[PDB]
Amino acid sequence: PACKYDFATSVLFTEAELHTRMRGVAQRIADDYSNCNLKPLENPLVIVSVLKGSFVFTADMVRILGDFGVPTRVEFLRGLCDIRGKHVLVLEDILDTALTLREVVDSLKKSEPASIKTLVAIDKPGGRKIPFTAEYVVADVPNVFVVGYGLDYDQSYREVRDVVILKPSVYETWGKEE
Amino acid sequence: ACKYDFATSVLFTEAELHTRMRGVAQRIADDYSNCNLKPLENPLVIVSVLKGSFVFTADMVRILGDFGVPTRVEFLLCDIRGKHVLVLEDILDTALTLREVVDSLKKSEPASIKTLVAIDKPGGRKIPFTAEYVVADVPNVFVVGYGLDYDQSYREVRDVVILKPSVYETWGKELER
Ligand SMILES: Nc1nc2c(ncn2C[C@@H](COCP(=O)(O)O)OC[C@@H](O)P(=O)(O)O)c(=O)[nH]1
Ligand SMILES: Nc1nc2c(ncn2C[C@@H](COCP(=O)(O)O)OC[C@@H](O)P(=O)(O)O)c(=O)[nH]1
After folding, report:
1. Which one of A124, B54, B94, B100 is most buried, counting C-beta atoms within 10 A?
2. Which DSSP letter does residue A144 get?
């Protein structure tokens, strides 16, 4: 068969596949935090959106979370104010070397929250520079460079609804920054 | 009878918004047809203003993609000189925010500037300002949902709703002793 995008070698996860998984994740999150007594305004779940591309994943997840009765409050680190004593769920579009999430988590602990967990959309477990495990993972991809669903190559292809493998010909031809 | 114990009524549903956003996307595609927009090289620079516009931005760029409009996003810049700029904002009221942003972006000499808002409140203007693209209009009422908040809450509400007056009153919890 052939690929749908002329800039991609293959499609790893469609928008439908992602959303389907995100409901399963949201179900578990709804169960885990059911004993935290989460309420809008009073005690909402503080969603920390790390990296610029995570705005697509964050926008979809919080609405799916809202369907499962989980009140949220967003902060963007693309912050560390008024999180003390509250629950913090760090959201990130992708995870491999785990260097980004590690520093953020260790930085949020300084403000001393009620709890802190991480939720990623795409996890590349074979890319770790340090040991790290996200409490919630939507999907796993091998060590290949992907774009779409917020993930970019030089600020492009974020708006792609599917997580696809970027063609090698694309990011070598665009190697013109010189 | 809307399914919201914290809202009195639903002004626009998620389905209604998306339907309108496709219609806007069709016009945006037609208008920027002579701009030669391509990924990487010359994409349409989306400038998302306000914190709660991330929901509207996330959906719109994907809908813009469906209609063949390549985009890159910046959140509120440099590297916009000579490039077409579309400024997105979740809501438009007094138009004090967009007026400042648009005028500030003009200093960087872009190819063109237009504005796209999801919810326009024409009767809330403190200064005159007209957006090129408007998804929906609402009268002078305070709304939440689709990125719009009340004290950082209710952004995750899929629909644009009017909060029940009991919400602010119960949230009158002034236990600051
Ligand atoms: N598109 C894409 N990006 C990747 C991929 N692998 C790593 N990255 C970079 C990532 C680093 O974060 C992970 P980590 O190493 O910190 O764990 O940062 C994203 C920034 O480009 P953004 O646009 O600001 O979000 C990948 O396969 N695809
Ligand atoms: N929820 C809600 N907010 C409104 C409404 N009218 C104005 N605002 C504030 C807006 C100001 O922008 C318009 P303007 O006066 O600049 O034209 O800014 C929003 C940031 O507070 P956010 O939470 O980061 O999105 C409304 O009906 N509902």
Report:
1. B54
2. -
